[PDB]
């Protein structure tokens, strides 16, 4: 678990994220797709995207980023009391989309990177620590659902 002080930084930061949800979502998906191009054959709608320029011009990628970060926001705002919100998403990713948990690790890293890159010298050391714990908490509760389903 995180402290109250820690939860407060996380939710402070997410409020800022929410001011520019599309632009944050776009950058997080582009970071993932470019650093780990195999994530991209999970997506028929995205397989044509052969360049960074094409990824950035794509309205549908923006729309997708908005869906993703909005779902992550709902979870985060539960301050660790997220069983009902986390459950369906763990179940769909393991069962239908078949996403290894290592891609959840990659996207967590993508978020911390994008935060510094969009707000250079505005993303405090205390802020990075709280967010990182928030993201690890999330990943940890996912791993428990993944073990339950024997997903490798
Ligand atoms: C922060 C972690 C993530 C969150 C909050 C999230 C959120 C979502 C949401 C809300 C949906 C739509 C409803 C559903 O199918 O459950 C979705 C669908 C999907 N996700 Fe994720 N996702 C995450 C990570 C990932 C990653 C890392 C991948 C692949 C590398 C992935 C692949 C997919 C696929 C293939 C779909 C189906 C797309 C569709 O219905 O068009 N997800 N995700
Ligand atoms: O729909 N879930 C996704 C999460 C991150 C990247 C692409 C899709
Ligand atoms: O930011 N939300 C979006 C919704 C539809 C298309 C593109 C972006
Ligand atoms: O744009 N349609 C979507 C459906 C499910 C997840 C993300 C996007
Ligand atoms: O690692 N699989 C996931 C579980 C829940 C939401 C997104 C991804
Ligand atoms: O059965 N698969 C597992 C998934 C996550 C953690 C441990 C086991």
- Spacing, Cα 142 to ligand 5 middle (Å): 6
Contact 10, 123 (CB under 8 A): no
At residue 144, the 3 state secondary structure works out as helix
Q: Which two tokens stand for residue 97?
A: 């989309």
- Segments forming the whole domain that contains residue 146: 1-152
Angstrom CA distances, 106 to 15, 32, 39, 78, 111, stand at 23, 7, 10, 23, 9
State how far Cα 134 lies from the chain centre.
11
The whole-angstrom separation of Cα 60 and Cα 66 is 10
Nearest-CA residue for atom 1 of ligand 1 = 72
DSSP assignment of 29-96, as one string? HHHHHHH-GGGGGG-GGGTT--SHHHHHH-HHHHHHHHHHHHHHHHHHTTTT--HHHHHHHHHHHHHT
The whole-angstrom separation of Cα 53 and Cα 98 is 28
Q: How many domains does the chain fold into? A: 1
Contact 2, 133 (CB under 8 A): yes
Experimental method: X-ray
For residue 123, give the nearest of 136, 112, 138 by alpha carbon. Answer: 112
Burial class (CB in 10 A: 0-12, 13-18, 19+), 96: exposed
- Spacing, Cα 72 to ligand 2 middle (Å): 11
Q: Which atom of ligand 1 is nearest to the CA of 91?
A: 16
Contact 140, 22 (CB under 8 A): no
Residue found under tokens 């402290």: 3
- For this experimental structure, what is the resolution in angstroms? 2.0
Nearest-CA residue for atom 1 of ligand 4 = 64
Please report, for the domain that includes residue 66, its CATH number.
Answer: 1.10.490.10
């Amino acid at each position: 678990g995180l402290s109250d002080g820690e939860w407060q930084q996380v939710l402070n930061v997410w409020g800022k994220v929410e001011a520019d949800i599309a632009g944050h979502g776009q950058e997080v998906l582009i970071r993932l797709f470019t650093g780990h191009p195999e994530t991209l054959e999970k997506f028929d709608k995205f397989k044509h995207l052969k360049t960074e320029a094409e990824m950035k011009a794509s309205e549908d990628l923006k729309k997708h980023g908005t869906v993703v970060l909005t779902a992550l926001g709902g979870i985060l705002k539960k301050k660790g009391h997220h069983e009902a919100e986390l459950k369906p998403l763990a179940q769909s990713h393991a069962t239908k989309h078949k996403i290894p948990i290592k891609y959840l690790e990659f996207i967590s890293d993508a978020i911390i990177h994008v935060l510094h890159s969009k707000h250079p010298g505005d993303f405090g050391a205390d802020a990075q620590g709280a967010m990182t714990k928030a993201l690890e908490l999330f990943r940890n509760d996912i791993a428990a659902k993944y073990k339950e389903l024997g997903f490798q």
